[model samples]
Target: QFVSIAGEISPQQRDALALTLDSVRLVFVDGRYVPALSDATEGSGYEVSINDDRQGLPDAIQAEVFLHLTESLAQSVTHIAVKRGQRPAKPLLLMHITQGVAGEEVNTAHYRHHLDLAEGAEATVIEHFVSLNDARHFTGARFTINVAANAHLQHIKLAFENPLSHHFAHNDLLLAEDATAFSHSFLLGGAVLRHNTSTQLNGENSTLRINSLAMPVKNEVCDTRTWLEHNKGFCNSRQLHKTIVSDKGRAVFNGLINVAQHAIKTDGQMTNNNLLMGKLAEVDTKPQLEIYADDVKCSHGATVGRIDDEQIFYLRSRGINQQDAQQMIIYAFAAELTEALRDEGLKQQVLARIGQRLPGG
Candidate 1:
């Protein structure tokens, strides 16, 4: 299904995608450096190393099973290291752009990013993946994040690919004692898109928050799979995933919370909510909880439905047009996650893109 939807890639399309990134003031095109756009602050406690080719490095987390596919295709790798007890003044942006070529053959690009935070450190990172319109391409990306004891990290991923593109992404997060990790993913476009997030709370009192939003339209398909593992006592994890499907599009969400034997006193919860706008739209959601510790608390729930007719009518009675009313409700449903973004520019970008894709935007 993914292969069929992605179609073929041409060299011209690939060049176009690279050129599009040149317009972004602070973006890296296909792992190439742009001096003025690069924002590496010297002596800012943040150290960045760019590897045009694969190489062994210390302090880099090894790729796991979920990333094997990406590792096989990876052409380049980037590693970011944060010194102990250091906090940067601004967030780091890592952009990976993949474009398709015009041909019967498939064009694939793979990238790996390793982010390491030292003890007592604090930082925020954004991973942005995008492509040119109708430039059918395939992207395989992997991310490994290590948060040391007492450290805090916020990771945001934005995927805005062409409607004929195929994207697969995997993330592995390891949190130490008292560490905090906030991971948010926004999936805006793609013909076939799949994302997986695996998190392990390996220290007592560690916390993990997983949030995601996916919107698919025009026969597109989107899938999200997440797993939260509690390996120590007194750990906590929570997840909230939302999806909006329109015009025969299909969306799937599978979330799992696993509490190990020694993970007593753990608290975990997951929720998946989906809104279907087209008569042929479909959604499948499964939230699972597996606990081996008797003292752990876990819960999960999912819901799928359409726009509330009553609410639509109420808005119409108040002088709002039908299309506008529907759009308002749909935007409100998505804003629940976008409103929580810490970066104003990112928040607005996401909102604007979502608005432009909506029925009446």
Candidate 2:
């Protein structure tokens, strides 16, 4: 049907995407036109696209999917489309999965991405997954980010994946002269999941930061693997990971920081920690450092353990029940880390969800 995109994307690109947007069952434009979420303006005027199958729609849930990507390029973007195509530096694409039908396996969803940065240019990219209760649906994505000489880019990925669903993702970052990047992820839910993130500092003065946190409860299982390579001189990198497990859940972490020979002036650090609240729950954290450069700084550490017994006992002795005391401590611990979210709305939303999921009592 005829439609318009609210965000100021490339007008030409928007036209191209509309031509191939045959699979879209619902369209929401601004707050005025929400035909998918409601029928206030249904049948006013519309035309089904020639490419549409018009078959029965699959049972699905949804959340607000707002994307605002207005580039700073003086001229128009070189090329853009939904389906896969050739890309010069790297193919960086974003996927917005709107629906998955009934009878679909919980672990069968996939997508890909590729990003390329021109010399002296920077790309600030963001990817978000919108869902009301995306805790039991499986999805997969792969990303390749490329940076050229004197160029810099930041890729921020936020996934509030389904709690009872499996999620798999991989990010491969390649760079050239003086390039840099930062990646941060806040994983809050999943039944079984694994994410592999790797970065190779190929340019001098290149930098990288990898931060992540996950809380898995019940029978959930989550694992994160990362590799940082200082293949050039005067590069810097750091990584931090935090995890919490409850009930019989488990969390796994593997981090590796590498500095090649002759890569002088390189600096790197890695850390992984886990807190547990149940006897049957467990976590495995491993941080590794590989250095060959004679003039460089590198370090790594890992920790896994239960909540502080003394603190819990102190709270219980203050007339608080054991359950309430434990929940209070756990809530404070998780909230401390998540408060760093810059967006006030996002911070409040996360805190509220954590409160609902991990009640202190």
Candidate 3:
């Protein structure tokens, strides 16, 4: 059967996002792409159309399995390229949505995306995912990013699937000489969510910064893993992964920073922090390092703690209710990452999602 995506999106579904959908967004629905709801390409600085050039992938068999699946199942792909020496005034959003009609079977989505930057170019891009009307669906997304020499990219990813959905994402980052990339991800949805990122610093003097936040409430699973491999000298890499679990929810994080023997003068650091909000909440965190270089600076650490009891108690003592007060503390925990976001519009949307994912709801 053929599915048509020509009608207007439901007001409830659209408004819940609390976003201003403009001409600079690419929209997808029900495992299909809809250009009608997407951006105008004339003035856009980046090119979107689709690279398989990486020195060594992650050393995990599971990673290779997914890579094989990408070629077998998701044979077709989407290519998005940033033109050389071009800069965009605003970020472009690649929005994907899965819907549940009044009487239709649940659907699954498999999307493959490839992005590449030209030499000396800069751009900001967002990967946005959402499920409307509590759709019971599964979405698998894969990304391959290639940054040219001296190019810089800001990549932000948001996952807002409903509680009844399953979400999994995998990404590969390859950087050239003197290139730099800063990435942030906020995960707040899905019954079982998983993410895998494998980055290779193939160029000398390249830098990378990755920060991620995962909050799971109720009986949900949010699992994340990242591998940052330093293959060249004079490279720098940093990562911060945080997870918040409420009620009987569970969160998992595993990170690995690998420095090759030839990668001298490499500076790498990884940190993981977990917060427990409920008596029964659980978390498993591991920050691993494999250094084979003589002259390098690398470190990894993890911390697990519970919410400050008096902070909540003090707020409640000041006339604030339990649920409302909890949000205040939650915001405070996430302040370090959220405040770094310069765009208030995007930050507000992120706050709205965080608020909606509180334990009560």
Candidate 4:
């Protein structure tokens, strides 16, 4: 069934003689259309439909979005959906990736998602964007999450743009009974990147986990914003973000948690930690909360610093090379996220990628 919906519209969205949508294809397994792609250009800016029939599902719902951009050209991708085959009682997991520099406004609609978990649900969604051009570019992405009762959702995103590009993204989520969600951001590139992740634990006992790591080098800047609302009781949340900067880069983290007046037994925590690779790098962070519920427990913390010289030297004196020791510490610091990945192969790939990126730690 084709449903009319509003799509994304970027401020820089445009058409140029030098740019073109080469080709788009839908993905599926078992020779059937699992998650189909609608070639919007073929018909009235959208053309296609598909259905999924796999049983042992409720484990994951996957989709892919790709766009091509260049120095002299501009483009945008809008309107996306990952529907459930039936009402599920568990979380619906999503993983997405984009290729090319988002030098234009990438507008997206409220990605309305529903969950019909049997005993409850939990979800984890990961989004990644890479660059294909060397020119300075700007890109924005938006999303919304709707979680069901007794469910949990995890949203992990990694944005690695070209050092000359700028990017922005925002996430808005809604939670139900005992439904919890985790969101993470890993920023390693881009001249400037602004990202926001927000969630509302609308139902009792729903939880949220937020984490981020930002590594900026040489005039690069990263800004991350997060917000969480505990509207009911017995809900718990934690936010931990770290930044490593060098070569006059700037990193900023803004985190906020709001607890309702009647919310009882709510537990919330927020922390921001940062390290500068060199003297010229700067880091800034703000953690805050609004609590009206008197019986709730909540806290916030922030830290910004450089490599601990004593610790760095201590490892060096043990025969470990300086570079190797530094890398090891950085790895150990960021490896806290590995516990979230259920797939061993995917976790290994991400671990390997981190090793290459944090060579000297």
Candidate 5:
């Protein structure tokens, strides 16, 4: 059914893609659900729907605004809702897997996802994006997340695409009073990647945390734009983004923190750090703070540098080879973001993907 909508794929390629997706708990192949391999948690307050039409969804305008950005041949939308005041015992894994036919013509997929968390709810969600083939393809995805009062949500995303693919993603988050939101993103592979994230703290005492890590190599390009707005008083927002670029890869980060005039006692901070492993690698970072309130505390910083040779040398003196020493350093740099995750399986899978893109795999 997916093949009919997307481009054509050979039997062998289809088999290969299926094998690759077998490891995921809840798999959506080309925007369709695979119930045979999916273990839907019954008591977890988890509800998912893979419908092309945006029927019964509470946020139709939010979904259409994101879809307007992409001109795609195939479009898919998924909805996830957690009941009010419910906390799940386990994290929910949601995988969106795409595969393209092996050819010069690239395939395109446009996907929109909506997540709704009711009042006093607590849950963890992991969204993984992967491609089966190395064919040059394009993917555009957008996410709308809504957190009600006193809700706590941990949202983790992994983007592991083909080396020749191009990816564009956008995420919007809304937080209510006393809500807590933690978002972590990992970008591992892509020829060109662009991500935009925007969060609004509309209620008092809400907290927002955004963490991101990206490793790009071999002429790959990665770009990120983030905006965090403190619309209410006594809100806290923190952002930390790290990038590792090698082999002429380019990375860009533009982050902004805005505090409203009446939002007094707001605390906001943003930091962007980059490591250039190759001489030709380049990185650009811009962290901005726009505050209209005088009694608010806000700060922003950015740093770009190469690996510390002294640290590598110190490790080498302990009998570790030069390559191994450098790999350890690189791993440690990316591990900080992964360690923030509470799920062990998700953390391990992310570490393995990051290892594959290290200096020496």
Candidate 6:
């Protein structure tokens, strides 16, 4: 039905790029879902549909204006649900592309997504953005995620759009008992980018891990924050956010971990590591923890690392590891972030971006 539409936009991108289409894909163009580029096969263990299938999803936890615009101005809603106890064969690649005329009117594209994994289900979903040109556009994505009991959700969201674009995304994660969620996010290039991850471990023994990395290059601003709540006991969450800023960009990060009074035996660790590559770059990193529980093994470290000679010596040569440790740490920070991704193409793509941004990699 939408073949001509796909041909019109996709022909413009034929020689520029292409990702291997081995998995199920959901494609969105200018806040509208294009069915031709998307695939929803029967017995695929999951399903997608237009409009909302929200059954008492209740209200979301978002800002007033954002929620207002999302509830009012957004025209499309993409609902995805994974069947109970069914593991799909391939990952879900949800891609969004935006095209707008530059300098005329700001194209503010708004889209809503709900990722629900039922009990004992497993899924790996990747959400990212790619644009056609240096058009002025604003992208706001509101995601409501629910991981049911004993389910697994591996989520990756990357924003590497054109320099004239702005992206603001908010994710709400409400997880059930023994659910596992791994969030891997990256903010590579944008004019102005902001995102906040709100997660609530609502049931006992739920496990969540967040690994976020940001690289704001050349007059970009990457504002990132996270609010985590441990409402149940025996839950474990580990969070790490690393920002590599240079070339006049600024990175601002503030993260808070809140533990309820009755949530005893909770194990939570949060860390923020920032590296400065040039003299003009800037970074503001803050990692916070608020605990009402008495018996919790919680720890945090907010370290700003600099790769200098005296810095390396004084930083690690004393009683700690030697100068080689500095190289090891740097390599680990750069490589391991991309290595955590299982897809080979994505890993190479990220590595290429990292190599391109740094002055001399």
TM-score of each prediction: 0.87, 0.67, 0.90, 0.69, 0.88, 0.88
Residue 260's C-alpha lDDT in candidate 1?
84
* lDDT (0 to 1) per candidate: 0.76, 0.57, 0.79, 0.58, 0.76, 0.78
Per-model RMSD to reference: 4.6, 12.6, 3.8, 10.7, 3.8, 5.4
Clashes of 2: 10
Residue 61, model 5: lDDT of: 26
Best by lDDT: 3
Write model 4 residue lDDT over 1-361, tens digit each, in one string. Answer: 1111223222232221111223332221111222333122233222223223222222211122321111112121222332332222322222222223233543221111222332354334455554434634445455545666766556666666578666766666777886767777777667888877777777887777888888777788889878777878898888788777766889988887888888899999888778777777788887778999888779987876677889989989989997688787777766675556666655665665566545453
Error of 6 at 147 (Å): 0.5
TM-score computed on alpha carbons, candidate 1? 0.87
Model 5: runs farther than 4 Å from truth? 1-24, 41-44, 52-67, 71-74
Give candidate 3 regions above 4 Å deviation.
Answer: 1-18, 21-23, 50-62, 100-106, 359-361
Question: Candidate 4: what lDDT?
Answer: 0.58
Model 5 lDDT per residue over 1-361, tens place: 2222463334465345332332325665654555765776555468776667665444322334434555233356667788888887667776667777654555666667778898999887777778876766677777788899999988877888888888888777989999999999887768998887888888998889999988888989988768788889999888899998988898999887878889999998888889998888888887888889999888888888888899888899989987678889887887777689665765666677777777567
- Model 4, residue 178: distance off in Å is 1.6
**Can you give the lDDT of residue 185 in candidate 6?**
89
Higher-TM-score candidate among 2 and 6?
6
Off by over 4 Å in 2: 1-100, 104-107, 119-124, 130-136, 149-152, 315-340
Model 1 per-residue lDDT at 257? 78
lDDT of 6 at 90: 87
The TM-score of predicted model 4 comes to 0.69
**How does residue 322 of candidate 2 score in lDDT?**
70
Backbone collisions counted per model: 6, 10, 4, 20, 0, 0
